[PDB]
Amino acid sequence: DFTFDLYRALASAAPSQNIFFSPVSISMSLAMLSLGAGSSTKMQILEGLGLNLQKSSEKELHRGFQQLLQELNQPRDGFQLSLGNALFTDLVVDLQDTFVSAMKTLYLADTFPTNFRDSAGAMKQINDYVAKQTKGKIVDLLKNLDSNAVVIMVNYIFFKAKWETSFNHKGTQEQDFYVTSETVVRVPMMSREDQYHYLLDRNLSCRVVGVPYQGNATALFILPSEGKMQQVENGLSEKTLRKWLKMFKKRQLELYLPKFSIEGSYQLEKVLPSLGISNVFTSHADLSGISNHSNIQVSEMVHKAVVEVDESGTRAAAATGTIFTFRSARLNSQRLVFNRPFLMFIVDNNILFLGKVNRP
């Protein structure tokens, strides 16, 4: 698995830490990059994306993403999704019009000649570019920039959508969240009893619940059994996802989910090589589709994903202006409380987001 092996790579590199990235967005930038890559550099990228038998249609691959981008970029109401890619290339590097054209046309991405000789100027231009493309949601992508950089590739994505059903601000109270058995933090816990797509996975030992967004996206929160986080991570795979997308049944639940913001920032040139994509970062890189200039390669491939989660939804919890019972108070339903590290997916027909919430 491209996506899940990448998740494990990132996880292994930063134990006991939050992880968060966009799979679709990463595949998108790699395909886009293959547009100017040649020989073994290109082939490593395509196989990494996993590319059909007969090494068939790359243009079909670009068609898919091309359409996907369009659908993703079409506004709704209270749906905030900013995603994009850009290539910053040194002044020496003469660009190929066929590359620049394909990038803008197919992926809506830009290629900007840049003066990396002025490290501090380039960093600010890049950060300002992203701050604007994100309507201010991602303001300081790069934290440092080398003077010898030749080409910087940045991929960014910010997402915030209204729940299909809201969380009553009256159900939010501070509560303990156990990062570990001995590390505890107070967090504002939202709550709402309702019918949710539930799933008990005895194989991996974890509970999965689905919460739909006011649109076409649905959040999946995975709660491992006490001490089973590593096991679950070891079990993550596209197959498993398919499996889960079937076991899903409606179940009355009193859900307790934290209000939180989560982000991941990565230098993919330090992890992708372990997944088989290495030539593109070396001096032996083949980016002849991009320029005829020798000695060029991707100096840095940064990726930043940001997502905010809160009460806001489309409609308020309609009800029990029907609560019938002789009891003083109705009894509780099954309770699912995320007050220990959990995993989270945000999926449409693809996987927009994948991460591990260790500390809200």
Side-chain angles (χ1 to χ4, degrees), residues 32-47:
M32 175 190 330
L33 180 58
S34 79
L35 289 177
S39 54
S40 57
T41 299
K42 174 176 188 170
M43 189 240 237
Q44 290 190 331
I45 293 176
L46 296 181
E47 309 190 314

Side-chain angles (χ1 to χ4, degrees), residues 199 201 204-213 215-238 240-241 243-244 247-248 250-270:
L199 180 172
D201 182 344
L204 262 46
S205 177
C206 65
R207 293 172 159 65
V208 182
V209 58
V211 197
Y213 274 118
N216 198 162
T218 296
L220 310 196
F221 299 104
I222 298 74
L223 180 69
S225 294
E226 310 268 7
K228 302 304 179 178
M229 177 56 89
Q230 194 73 68
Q231 172 166 299
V232 176
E233 293 177 310
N234 282 341
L236 285 188
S237 71
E238 301 202 301
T240 293
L241 190 53
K243 192 190 71 181
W244 286 343
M247 301 173 90
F248 274 153
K250 281 278 192 167
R251 181 178 288 199
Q252 192 62 37
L253 269 55
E254 170 137 51
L255 179 68
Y256 288 98
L257 189 65
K259 171 176 184 177
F260 67 94
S261 279
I262 189 175
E263 71 183 73
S265 191
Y266 315 88
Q267 306 284 166
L268 304 172
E269 70 271 9
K270 304 170 174 62

Side-chain angles (χ1 to χ4, degrees), residues 187-194 196-199 201 204-213 215-238 240-241 243-244 247-248 250-313 316-319 321 324-329 331-332 334-339:
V187 312
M189 268 274 229
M190 313 179 292
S191 60
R192 192 182 79 211
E193 197 174 16
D194 191 38
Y196 302 103
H197 270 92
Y198 181 78
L199 180 172
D201 182 344
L204 262 46
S205 177
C206 65
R207 293 172 159 65
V208 182
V209 58
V211 197
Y213 274 118
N216 198 162
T218 296
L220 310 196
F221 299 104
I222 298 74
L223 180 69
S225 294
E226 310 268 7
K228 302 304 179 178
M229 177 56 89
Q230 194 73 68
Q231 172 166 299
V232 176
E233 293 177 310
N234 282 341
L236 285 188
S237 71
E238 301 202 301
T240 293
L241 190 53
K243 192 190 71 181
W244 286 343
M247 301 173 90
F248 274 153
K250 281 278 192 167
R251 181 178 288 199
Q252 192 62 37
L253 269 55
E254 170 137 51
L255 179 68
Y256 288 98
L257 189 65
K259 171 176 184 177
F260 67 94
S261 279
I262 189 175
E263 71 183 73
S265 191
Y266 315 88
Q267 306 284 166
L268 304 172
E269 70 271 9
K270 304 170 174 62
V271 53
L272 283 191
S274 68
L275 300 188
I277 298 172
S278 59
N279 284 44
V280 70
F281 308 116
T282 67
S283 310
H284 189 60
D286 187 344
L287 293 170
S288 57
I290 296 184
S291 170
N292 59 40
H293 196 93
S294 78
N295 297 189
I296 60 168
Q297 61 281 139
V298 173
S299 307
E300 261 180 282
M301 184 170 147
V302 180
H303 171 82
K304 181 155 196 172
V306 184
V307 165
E308 310 182 326
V309 169
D310 65 12
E311 293 84 1
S312 294
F324 285 120
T325 184
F326 63 85
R327 286 179 164 59
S328 295
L331 190 60
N332 315 156
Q334 187 186 310
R335 284 165 64 171
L336 185 57
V337 52
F338 292 82
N339 61 174

